Amino acid sequence: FRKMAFPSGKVESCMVQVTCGTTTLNGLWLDDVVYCPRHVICTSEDMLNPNYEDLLIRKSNHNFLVQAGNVQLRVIGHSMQNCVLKLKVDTANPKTPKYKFVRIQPGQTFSVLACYNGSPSGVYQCAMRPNFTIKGSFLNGSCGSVGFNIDYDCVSFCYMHHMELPTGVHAGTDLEGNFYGPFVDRQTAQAAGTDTTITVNVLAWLYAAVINGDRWFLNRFTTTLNDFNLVAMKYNYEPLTQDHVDILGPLSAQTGIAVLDMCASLKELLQNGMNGRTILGSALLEDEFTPFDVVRQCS
Amino acid sequence: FRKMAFPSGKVESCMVQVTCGTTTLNGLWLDDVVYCPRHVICTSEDMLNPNYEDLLIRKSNHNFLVQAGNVQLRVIGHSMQNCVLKLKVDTANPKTPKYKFVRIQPGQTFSVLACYNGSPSGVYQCAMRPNFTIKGSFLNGSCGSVGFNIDYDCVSFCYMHHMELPTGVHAGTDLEGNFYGPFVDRQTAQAAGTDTTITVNVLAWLYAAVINGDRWFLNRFTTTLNDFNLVAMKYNYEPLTQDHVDILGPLSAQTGIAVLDMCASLKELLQNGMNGRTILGSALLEDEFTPFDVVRQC
Numbered sequence: 025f026r027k028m029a030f031p032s033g034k035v036e037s038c039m040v041q042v043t044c045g046t047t048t049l050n051g052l053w054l055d056d057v058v059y060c061p062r063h064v065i066c067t068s069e070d071m072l073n074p075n076y077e078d079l080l081i082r083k084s085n086h087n088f089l090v091q092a093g094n095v096q097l098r099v100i101g102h103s104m105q106n107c108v109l110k111l112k113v114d115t116a117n118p119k120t121p122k123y124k125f126v127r128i129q130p131g132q133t134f135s136v137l138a139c140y141n142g143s144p145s146g147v148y149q150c151a152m153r154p155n156f157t158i159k160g161s162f163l164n165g166s167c168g169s170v171g172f173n174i175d176y177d178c179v180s181f182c183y184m185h186h187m188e189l190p191t192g193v194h195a196g197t198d199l200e201g202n203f204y205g206p207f208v209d210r211q212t213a214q215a216a217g218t219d220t221t222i223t224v225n226v227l228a229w230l231y232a233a234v235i236n237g238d239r240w241f242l243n244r245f246t247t248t249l250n251d252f253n254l255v256a257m258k259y260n261y262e263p264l265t266q267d268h269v270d271i272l273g274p275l276s277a278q279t280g281i282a283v284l285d286m287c288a289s290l291k292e293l294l295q296n297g298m299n300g301r302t303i304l305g306s307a308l309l310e311d312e313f314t315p316f317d318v319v320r321q322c323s
Numbered sequence: 324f325r326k327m328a329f330p331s332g333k334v335e336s337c338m339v340q341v342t343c344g345t346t347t348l349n350g351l352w353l354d355d356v357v358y359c360p361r362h363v364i365c366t367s368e369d370m371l372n373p374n375y376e377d378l379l380i381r382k383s384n385h386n387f388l389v390q391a392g393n394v395q396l397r398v399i400g401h402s403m404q405n406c407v408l409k410l411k412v413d414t415a416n417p418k419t420p421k422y423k424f425v426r427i428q429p430g431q432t433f434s435v436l437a438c439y440n441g442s443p444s445g446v447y448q449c450a451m452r453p454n455f456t457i458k459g460s461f462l463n464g465s466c467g468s469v470g471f472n473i474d475y476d477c478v479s480f481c482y483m484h485h486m487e488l489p490t491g492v493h494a495g496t497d498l499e500g501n502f503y504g505p506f507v508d509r510q511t512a513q514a515a516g517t518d519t520t521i522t523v524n525v526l527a528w529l530y531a532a533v534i535n536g537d538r539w540f541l542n543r544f545t546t547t548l549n550d551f552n553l554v555a556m557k558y559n560y561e562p563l564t565q566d567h568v569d570i571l572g573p574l575s576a577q578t579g580i581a582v583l584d585m586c587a588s589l590k591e592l593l594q595n596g597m598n599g600r601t602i603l604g605s606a607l608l609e610d611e612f613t614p615f616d617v618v619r620q621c
């Protein structure tokens with residue numbers, strides 16, 4: 025059981041480079057539109073307080089250099105949607121996948137295709153944290169990299185990359201250009217809200233460990249949902265809802281371990297520690313696998 | 324630091340399925356050849372101790388069903404090379420990337436594109452253990468999935484998947500069909516050697532820590548390579564080779580910390596423990612990031 029990203033080929037065929045003046049970042053080319061972070065139009069003396077509508081009206085189509093591989097794409101129009109710029113180009117992308125734009129929920133996972141200069145560099149899994157940051161791996165020039173899920177050849181784009189916080193975690197928008205969390209696309213040091221642990225994911229991961237032949241952390245005890253949530257909240261874990269319990273049903277039925285029995289296992293791990301032992305190779309409780317991630321991989 | 328796979332598109336375009344009878348494995352289509360594990364020709368009562376040479380003489384080109392999706396590729400020749408079957412087909416793959424077949428060493432990492440019935444399902448990074456197993460994620464139907472690295476658009480294929488050991492780790496071949504480690508392609512419970520920690524990668528991790536300002540473990544000692552290797556083996560760490568010293572060269576230059584000085588730092592950590600301190604936030608030393616991976620992410 026490992027962190028597993030979706031195959032990235034359908035998305036790689038959509039990554040382009042977008043240059044405005046001195047600024048170069050990545051864009052996403054779908055049909056005849058290139059989506060990219062709007063601050064491609066900012067110079068260094070603009071990043072602190074950019075009045076984006078006022079900056080954009082001053083730009084012409086020919087101010088935008090869009091490159092797909094070695095081929096330049098001519099911008100024939102542009103519009104802004106929140107923090108995303110939509111460049112209309114004179115060529116539709118012939119490898120546009122079936123796709124959707126979705127806004128994901130905290131606790132859900134996606135694959136990130138990290139890109140530099142329009143060229144894909146790496147792919148890895150991320151969870152949307154409860155405080156709406158992600159713990160990614162992004163360097164200078166990574167803006168415009170996207171996150172996505174795939175379901176039967178349909179690519180659901182859910183993230184475009186914009187920012188690395190002082191703490192080293194990452195912030196970005198959906199493909200409508202609305203940030204996840206309270207972040208703003210200006211060159212300022214921004215703090216996130218206090219993060220918490222994704223309880224339903226930790227439980228899914230404990231089930232994954234049992235499916236894979238590890239049972240050492242189980243115990244003979246049970247707990248009520250509310251008593252578990254009282255302890256969970258004390259340890260900065262998100263509350264577990266009945267919807268979460270239902271969602272864990274399939275994993276519960278596969279292993280024969282009731283959800284509240286697994287909650288009693290996690291309660292013991294929170295109160296007693298792991299005592300130097302490991303689960304699925306980790307010395308820490310892992311919260312970035314969803315129940316679906318476990319089912320998709322183990323089955 | 325994240326375990327980061329290579330973008331998989333160039334390899335996705337090369338995955339096909341190969342069927343003999345009711346047995347379907349994944350295959351790799353490059354130019355006009357498809358490569359796949361040879362036991363696609365096996366029946367269930369042939370798997371304990373297959374006579375592959377005998378089994379292959381009873382096969383003709385027309386017994387092999389090669390499909391890209393639902394599109395059949397006609398087989399015009401077949402041959403066996405070690406544990407892989409090479410099927411010549413009448414169509415050169417137009418999406419064949421620039422490629423090489425390489426045989427990797429323990430400690431080297433690569434991306435695995437897990438595939439089922441020729442259809443790619445997920446991608447993740449793996450490290451070849453010193454006992455020549457990988458800690459993969461493979462189910463029934465995964466054989467023929469490949470592992471690879473990508474350097475300047477050239478795909479270096481290094482792994483093809485064959486087997487899950489009773490311990491749950493995985494074993495396979497290079498693309499010439501030679502197994503990594505002492506394993507054989509038979510339906511049989513096989514044990515790997517006792518595994519060890521990948522010293523060269525731990526050193527890379529320590530260099531990554533220094534690069535990021537976490538350097539409490541640096542000391543004013545040095546060691547010879549031989550003295551280090553004798554200590555390392557007593558803690559179940561791999562001995563360093565000359566090649567390991569050389570691949571740590573760029574990180575040593577970047578930090579100004581000689582390789583043997585970092586070895587003396589690691590030796591101290593082995594003999595004395597971390598004493599509750601951490602390195603890069605972790606109480607455990609990471610051994611699945613190569614010097615290349617560290618440079619990639621730093």
Ligand SMILES: COc1cccc2[nH]c(C(=O)N[C@@H](CC(C)C)C(=O)N[C@@H](C[C@@H]3CCNC3=O)C(=O)c3nc4ccccc4s3)cc12
Nearest residue numbers: 063162163164165166167186187188190209210211212213
């Ligand atoms: C005093 O200001 C700070 C104080 C403390 C921490 C801080 N973080 C950031 C911050 O992240 N800024 C954004 C840009 C803002 C405008 C959204 C930014 O540089 N995004 C990167 C990805 C970054 C870079 C490093 N790895 C990350 O993922 C991206 O590619 C883009 N680069 C530029 C460069 C110039 C113009 C546009 C873009 S868009 C500022 C900052």
Ligand SMILES: COc1cccc2[nH]c(C(=O)N[C@@H](CC(C)C)C(=O)N[C@@H](C[C@@H]3CCNC3=O)C(=O)c3nc4ccccc4s3)cc12
Nearest residue numbers: 362461462463464465466485486487489508509510511512
């Ligand atoms: C008493 O025998 C055992 C005792 C204790 C542990 C054991 N492990 C294996 C073992 O691995 N066998 C090989 C096959 C051998 C011939 C290399 C095998 O099933 N490979 C799988 C990938 C496996 C499956 C589960 N996840 C893993 O990665 C693969 O895809 C292939 N499937 C077939 C199906 C039919 C024909 C060819 C192939 S090749 C046997 C075994």
